[PDB]
């Protein structure tokens, strides 16, 4: 069973909602056992000696901290844990390789010739590790509200992080949490104290940087390394810029719908706008304004999209390009950015004429 | 009443004498951060300004100071001191400094001499000043008398909830103000509207995450690039982001006034702050663990750590916000009290080292 799921997710356009129906009754642990196949893949578990049983007694018990809900759910993390796997694997036109300190090398692919590069030659395993996990916890215990929501309400865990990243700090503290909860889910358990020590940072780092108030911010300093006409670029020797680079490509899975095909696209902007209709009622209910777009009356989906895809995810994704580091073929044709620009064109068109 | 004009005048002066206030108190030593708090809301206004009942206010913050623990450093006192601290930076004229004027405090306990001066006051609106000062109070509310390398270490419980980063200082901010929403008897600002009370929250609690000295060179470097460049005009009073960074910088001096004051208060800070440091150390050697550098009361090196102290923390912070003009002094050249006490305490401790 491992080659069939393995083939299946070599496709960028993973038919995820396929597997969760194929799995059916035990569609629970579609989390957990992606996790299996892709570290098997990249070699995660032989690299760093990773005992099968706490790693896979950690990840059940992390997926059923996953709720119930629309969109933040089990499906969504294992949407953005494949996404990261596939954009730091698949070869990259015209990137150069480095050593391809452990590094990984994906068993699906092998880079076709020397004029493609992958990510996974370029940043050191223990990295790219801390940016898998961290998308395994980048959405744990999601309680399906916004970080405005939880603000404007005083909610306790509002008030517990001072409004700095309410939901952000709160996958990343539970999760731990839950790691350090019981012996039998320490599967790092032959890293040293100052390899645990990082990677727990970088996995830290990696799921802080999902926060869409600082989207901005990150942007304007990914520009500022890799898209520097006067500068050198990207250093891969450098430690923080390998960090911005993981921070950069999980903020890009995290809203990867735009960015496939329009079956896979409107399946995720239907889960999203149901859980932003729970929470327009609730917001309803207690008298407080409905936030936009949360209001099932007036959903106003074309303008949502739009906006979404223009000044979020648009500039993300041009970004991530104009720096070399999207895997395509050669012109060059890059996959996602053609379901992009697609998308954007369907759903300017639903606007303009609606 | 009769209480009230001595105690004025005895915090007026920049060395003022807490400890003093704190014997006299004796019994009643525990209520000291409220008194305080108390006298300098009345002094610059702020009760009448947004019309605070006194009921809730002292209710809130008795509780507020019943949360510091009976520890040698961060405890009610210290709060107490940094709060005047940041009151006397605030109110006191500085040399060379414009007056502007929302509404904006004046202490009732100074007037700016002539026009040449120009008070904190009358430049940082009232909100602010009192989002700065309520700040200063629950600055280091709950405090475990442990280091955040401690907690990382260790993984304490606090260390885990907040990533590593900034664990005491967020869990001070975010611990006073569960206390404060944790009863309507401590609403004192029931008569600010859900915009000022959202602006006010989120000014105190920037205000106490910036006491993390992990982040000191950062803000410092920030704060250099505003108000220390050559080529600029230093702060812009209309801008938000400057005055809150100002205030930032306020709070950061007062949390480490202690070598810019006279011998007698630095030295008794010192003997708190290391008496906090050899429990930490002892706690760190029962568990095995490297103990922390001047944690380890075998080899004390006092000297060596006051004059990094003075020298890495505390230095560059008082030249940078003297070298913006924003320190109280009197004309002469400009003679700056606390600049003296710190030129003279960091003679003092080089002369110990070398010696
Ligand atoms: B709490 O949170 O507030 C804290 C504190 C501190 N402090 C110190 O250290 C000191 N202080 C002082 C002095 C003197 C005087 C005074 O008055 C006020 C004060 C001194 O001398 C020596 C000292 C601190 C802290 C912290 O943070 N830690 C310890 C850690 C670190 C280290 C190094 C660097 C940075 C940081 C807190
Ligand atoms: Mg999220
Ligand atoms: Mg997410
Ligand atoms: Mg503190
Ligand atoms: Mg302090």
């Known amino acids: 069973e491992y080659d069939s799921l393995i083939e299946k997710m070599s496709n960028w356009n993973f038919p995820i909602f396929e ?29 760093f000696k990773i005992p099968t049983q706490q790693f896979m007694n950690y990840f059940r018990a992390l997926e ?33 390789q480095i050593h391809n300190i452990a590094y990984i090398s994906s068993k699906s692919c092998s880079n076709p010739d020397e004029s493609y ?8 395993a223990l990295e790219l590790m801390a940016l898998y996990v961290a998308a395994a916890m980048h959405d744990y215990d999601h309680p399906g509200r916004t970080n405005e929501f939880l603000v404007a309400t005083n909610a306790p865990q509002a008030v517990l992080y001072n409004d700095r990243s309410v939901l952000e700090n709160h996958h990343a503290a539970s999760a731990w949490n839950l790691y350090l909860s019981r012996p039998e889910y320490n599967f790092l358990l032959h890293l ?3 390899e645990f020590e990082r990677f727990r940072f970088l996995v830290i780092e990696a799921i802080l940087a999902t926060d869409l108030k600082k989207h901005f911010d990150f942007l304007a300093e990914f520009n500022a ?6 500068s050198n670029g990207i250093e891969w020797s450098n430690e ?10 999980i903020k890009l899975a995290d809203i990867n719908g735009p960015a496939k095909v329009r ?12 859980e932003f209709y729970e929470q327009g009622d609730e917001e309803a209910n207690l008298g407080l304004p409905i936030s936009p777009f949360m209001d099932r009356s007036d959903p106003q989906l074309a ?42 064109k369907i759903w300017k068109e639903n606007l303009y004429f609606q």
Not at 240 to 249: A, I, T
Request: aromatic share 8%; charged share 15%.
């Open 19 to 47: 597997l969760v129906e194929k799995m059916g009754e035990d569609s629970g642990r579609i989390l957990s056992q992606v996790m299996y196949t892709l570290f098997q893949d990249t070699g995660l578990l032989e690299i």
């Open 64 to 96: 059923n901290g996953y709720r119930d809900i629309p969109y933040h759910n089990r499906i969504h993390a294992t949407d953005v844990l494949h996404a990261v796997w596939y954009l730091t694997t698949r070869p990259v036109p015209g990137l150069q």
């Open 117 to 124: 590069g992958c990510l996974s030659s370029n940043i050191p």
């Open 192 to 194: 040293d104290h100052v």
């Open 225 to 230: 390394k890799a898209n520097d006409v006067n």
């Open 240 to 249: 923080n810029d390998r960090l911005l680079v993981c921070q950069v490509c």
């Open 263 to 274: 079956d896979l696209h409107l399946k995720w902007t239907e889960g999203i706008v149901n």
């Open 303 to 344: 303008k949502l999209q739009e906006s979404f895809i223009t000044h979020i995810v648009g500039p993300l994704c041009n970004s991530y390009d104009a720096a070399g580091l999207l895997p395509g073929q050669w012109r060059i044709f890059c996959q996602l950015m053609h379901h992009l620009t697609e998308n954007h």
